[PDB]
Every structure is written in C-alpha cells, then in structure tokens.
C-alpha cells in the first residue's frame, strides 16, 4: 500500500476504542487507525509478554470487534480484514 491512505469512518465501537487512546477524529486513514489500535493494544497489555508475535484479545472489546480470541501481528492482511468490518470506507 498505500491502501493505507484509504479514508475510513469507524463504526461506534471501534470509534469509542480509538478515542480512549486519544484519537480525536471521526474520519481517518487506514494507517492512522492501525497506529491507534497498536497504542490501545499497548496500554491494555494485550501483546504476548513472551514476545511470540501474538495479541491475546479474548475477554476485551478488541476481541469482540475482531471475532477471534487471539491473532498473529504478522498476518497483516488478516488484521486489515478484521478492521474493515468495523468501518465504512469513504
Ligand atoms: C506490539 C504491538 C502488538 C502493540 N504492536 C505491533 O506488533 C505493531 C502494530 C501496529 C503499528 O502501529 O505498527 N498497529 C497494530 C494494530 C494491531 Cl490490531 C496489531 C498490531 C499492530 N506491528 C508492528 O510493529 C504489527 C502490524 C503493523 C501493521 C499492520 Cl497492517 C499489521 C500489524
Ligand atoms: K459497532
Ligand atoms: K476529515
């Protein structure tokens, strides 16, 4: 990409989560969304402490938004797919 420059409007749940890490917008690019999702993962400590490239999001809003209990941070296309479903593209 840039496919990452894609303009997007997050749906209410996703928008609430981004604003909780200080996102101050209703419309974003795909790369801004990932930045703030990465920062949410950090503050909630959902990344594997054993450093095995996995986010454990079960029993957390992210888990509910992504429809999985855990994901690899290396599956970039998978992550964008899970993100797009919580978004209206502009
Ligand atoms: C340690 C941890 C889990 C907080 N962060 C990452 O592994 C980030 C990462 C970023 C970042 O802002 O780069 N944003 C993310 C959003 C989600 Cl949901 C999960 C992980 C990341 N990443 C590499 O550095 C992996 C990665 C980068 C781009 C794409 Cl399209 C997909 C994965
Ligand atoms: K929603
Ligand atoms: K705008």
Length reported for the chain: 90
Query: What CATH number has the domain bearing residue 5?
Result: 1.10.245.10
Nearest to 26 by CA among 11, 44, 36, 38: 11
> Contact, 51 vs 28, CB < 8 A?
no
Cα 55–Cα 83–Cα 70 angle in degrees, nearest 5: 20
The domain total for the chain is 1
Task: Report d(CA 3, CA 56) in Å as an integer.
Answer: 26
- List all residues whose CB is within 6 A of at least one atom of ligand 1: 34-35, 37-38, 41-42, 47, 55, 73, 76, 79-80
Identify the domain containing residue 32 by its residue range. Answer: 1-90
Please name every residue paired with 70 in a beta bridge, in sequence order, or none if there are none: 56
Q: The tokens 């209206």 sit on which residue?
A: 88
Show the DSSP H helices in 8-88 as ranges: 12-20, 30-44, 61-66, 76-84
């Amino acid at each position: 990409a840039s496919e990452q420059e894609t303009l997007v409007r997050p749906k209410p749940l996703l928008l609430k989560l981004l604003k909780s890490v200080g996102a101050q917008k209703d419309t974003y690019t795909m790369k801004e969304v990932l930045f703030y999702l990465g920062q949410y993962i950090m503050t909630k400590r959902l990344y594997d402490e054993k450093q095995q490239h996995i986010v454990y999001c079960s029993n957390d809003l992210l888990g509910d938004l992504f429809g999985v209990p855990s994901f690899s941070v290396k599956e970039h296309r998978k992550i964008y797919t899970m993100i797009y479903r919580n978004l209206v593209v502009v």
